[PDB]
């Protein structure tokens, strides 16, 4: 684990991650689809060897040795504001799984369902809360990769605000 566990933000691709792990925002077909997905193809192609899986869920593939976990929520053009709830959150609790499986210090993480699959609307409230509620209890570092500033400015209140 790391010796003070913490969160931090940074505006930047998360394909140029300083993390022993990266946590993809896959779709369930592992292909190689676009934004975060599409970086993360483009960095680490060999970890898209059977790396589909369903909504909720996370499946690791070793890129080498470094780790890509494909971490799959819900497109909420799809799912029911209730449901897509549901995925979302268990997506992140799969990732705390195969965060503390791996045994690393630290992880990379995008916020799941933000982008294309966000059903045009504004979740980096909801997104992050799941975050937080599945990775509290790890000891890993965790390092969120975001792209807006506007976004860098929310997250990294909401991290300090919790101190
Ligand atoms: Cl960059
Ligand atoms: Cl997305
Ligand atoms: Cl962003």
């Known amino acids: 684990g790391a010796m003070a566990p913490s969160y931090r933000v940074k505006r930047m691709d998360i394909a140029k ?50 780790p890509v976990i494909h971490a799959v929520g819900p497109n909420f053009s799809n799912y029911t504001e209730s449901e897509g709830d549901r995925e979302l959150a268990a997506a992140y609790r799969e990732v705390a799984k195969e965060v503390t499986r791996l045994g690393v210090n630290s992880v990379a993480i995008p916020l799941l369902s933000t982008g294309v699959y966000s059903g045009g609307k504004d979740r980096l409230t909801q997104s992050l809360n799941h975050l937080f509620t599945a990775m509290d209890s790890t000891d890993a570092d965790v390092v969120i990769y975001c792209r807006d500033k506007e976004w860098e400015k929310k997250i990294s209140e909401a991290i300090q605000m919790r101190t």
């Open 17 to 66: 991650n300083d993390e022993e792990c990266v946590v993809n925002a896959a779709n369930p077909r592992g292909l190689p689809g676009d934004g975060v997905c599409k970086a993360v193809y483009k960095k680490w192609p060999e970890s898209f060897k059977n790396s589909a899986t369903p909504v909720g869920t996370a499946k690791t593939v070793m890129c080498g040795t470094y």
